[PDB]
Structures are given as structure tokens and as C-alpha cells.
């Protein structure tokens, strides 16, 4: 019984620790795709505004 009680005591503490770590580790991999696409849509929209 205690083997499966120690199983949650890994499972719960692991899902809580992995949530709050991978929030920053993957948010800082979406922020860099925003860097790559703002360097496209700057290069589109500003080039209509430079024509007006």
C-alpha cells in the first residue's frame, strides 16, 4: 500500500515542479518565434506605410 503512497509522493511533487519550470522553459521558446515573425510583419506593414 505504502509503495503506491510513495508513488503519488513522487507523482504530485513532480507535476507541480515540472509545471512551474516548463512554463518559463517553453514560454522562452514562443517569445523567440515572436521575434522571428515580428521581423516579418515589420517588413510587410511598415513597407505599406512607407508607400502612403
Amino acid at each position: 500500500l505504502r509503495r503506491q503512497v510513495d508513488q503519488l509522493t513522487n507523482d504530485k511533487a513532480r507535476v507541480e515542479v515540472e509545471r512551474d519550470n516548463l512554463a518559463e522553459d517553453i514560454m522562452r521558446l514562443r517569445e523567440k518565434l515572436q521575434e522571428e515573425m515580428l521581423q516579418r510583419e515589420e517588413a510587410e506593414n511598415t513597407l505599406q506605410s512607407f508607400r502612403q
Binding site: 510513495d6 509522493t9 515542479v17 519550470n21 512554463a23 518559463e24 514560454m27 512607407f50
Partner: protein, 52 residues
């Protein structure tokens, strides 16, 4: 200065949006540091819940 203004409006707007994207990156990097605060905390405490 009229010729310059045609790049200067784009340089201003790109350097504005690249600052503003670094500013949305820095608030989201402090979100990676909050999610690291939870990761060091669940590492310290939830590991000792599993020792508990």
C-alpha cells in the same frame, strides 16, 4: 531629412517594437523566474514530502 524620414519612420517603429518585444520578453522571463521559484520550491519541499 525628407529622404531620411522614409527610413527613419521604419527605424523608429522597428526599434520601438523591438524594445516593446524585449519588454514583453522581460515580463515573460520574470514568468520563467516565477515558474523557476515554483520548480526550486517543489524540488526542495515535494521531494521531502516523498521522504515524509
Amino acid at each position: 531629412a525628407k529622404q531620411e524620414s522614409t527610413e527613419y519612420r521604419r527605424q523608429v517603429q522597428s526599434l520601438t517594437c523591438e524594445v516593446d518585444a524585449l519588454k514583453g520578453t522581460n515580463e515573460s522571463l520574470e514568468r520563467q523566474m516565477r515558474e523557476m521559484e515554483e520548480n526550486f520550491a517543489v524540488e526542495a519541499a515535494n521531494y521531502q514530502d516523498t521522504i515524509g
